[PDB]
Design a protein around this ligand. Structure first.
Ligand SMILES: C[C@]12CC[C@@H]3c4ccc(O)cc4CC[C@H]3[C@@H]1CC[C@@H]2O
Ligand SMILES: C[C@]12CC[C@@H]3c4ccc(O)cc4CC[C@H]3[C@@H]1CC[C@@H]2O
Ligand SMILES: [Ca+2]
Ligand SMILES: [Ca+2]
Lengths: 175, 175
């Protein structure tokens, strides 16, 4: 079952999941994405919209991560273009103080020394928004137009056991 | 003609080139490297060893860039492993406020919003050291053992016209 990463204008996310960081036993996520869209947000996450946020998106067809927290502030592009209309497996996880990005089974990016343990964040609640941000795009380190015209499927986010709740503005439109 | 990136213990660089930034008309470099060594420095560069430095090396066989300046401080791994004993083409250049890394003709990493124009650096003199750093490895953001047992060939560094001088401790040992 595949869902549309964009719905309507393409402003707000198609879904927001909230997690209790003190209950996480897994700090990784994975999913498949397919699109012809060269720019947009795949997912945004934060423990604090001002002080500790993260965004994985596409720019010029390639993955881009923006991260802003106490330890690091960055805007980094990496990996092959994914806007070739084919399904691509994507994994994002924490490994020690690093954030690793794997695409189609290959590690394409490792942001080192960027964060303390998820389970140790001052604000023990993490939000994960799909297909959109939880603040205006103008507030990104480097703005981009969030709308991502693509499909998401086979997605797993951290541990379902740590998930506090999940919301969706409109009905998840299938692909 | 190929030269050894390591000579002797593997502490100091095999060569140091100095450039006048006010005369540069090209902010890119390229070379080929071959090695079985998973860790080490390919090249280091700075306009200031304390406040504005850069290091391209290998860690776990993959490219890693560390950069420290007024705009950004990072430690980032990216691209495929290069320690497969085969020749690999590598290009490192500035594009706007970004630093791009291309391997075997493919862009594998783009560090965005990391620097003002090279021609505008307070200290208009850039040093490029090959196979080593110009400060102790303990001073890196993330230390690694600098010795890189590999070969370098077909190397071009910025513009020869902007090169002020070049030095080499020992005789460049051919591969
Ligand atoms: C945990 C994830 C990787 C690490 C990400 C991170 C990493 C560091 C940080 O300071 C904040 C965030 C928020 C979103 C997180 C992501 C949500 C799912 C993904 O697996
Ligand atoms: C200009 C190069 C890319 C950009 C690098 C950089 C980029 C930003 C910075 O603040 C310092 C340096 C020093 C070394 C530079 C490199 C030396 C050769 C390479 O082409
Ligand atoms: Ca788009
Ligand atoms: Ca080594």
């Amino acid at each position: 079952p595949a869902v549309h990463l964009s719905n309507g204008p393409g402003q707000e996310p198609i879904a927001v999941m909230t997690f209790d960081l003190t209950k996480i036993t897994k700090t990784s996520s994975s999913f498949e994405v397919r699109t012809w869209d060269p720019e947009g947000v795949i997912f945004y996450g934060d423990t604090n919209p001002k002080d500790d946020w993260f965004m994985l998106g596409l720019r010029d067809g390639r993955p881009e991560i923006q991260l802003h927290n106490h330890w690091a502030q960055l805007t980094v592009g990496a990996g092959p273009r994914l806007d070739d209309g084919r399904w691509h497996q994507v994994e994002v996880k924490m490994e020690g103080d690093s954030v690793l990005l794997e695409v189609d089974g290959e590690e394409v990016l490792r942001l080192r020394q960027v964060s303390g343990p998820l389970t140790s964040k001052r604000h023990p609640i993490m939000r994960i928004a799909l297909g959109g941000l939880l603040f205006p795009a103008s507030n990104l380190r480097l703005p981009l137009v969030p709308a991502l015209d693509g499909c998401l499927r086979r997605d797993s986010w951290l541990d379902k056991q740590a998930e506090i709740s999940a919301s969706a503005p409109t009905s998840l439109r299938s692909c």
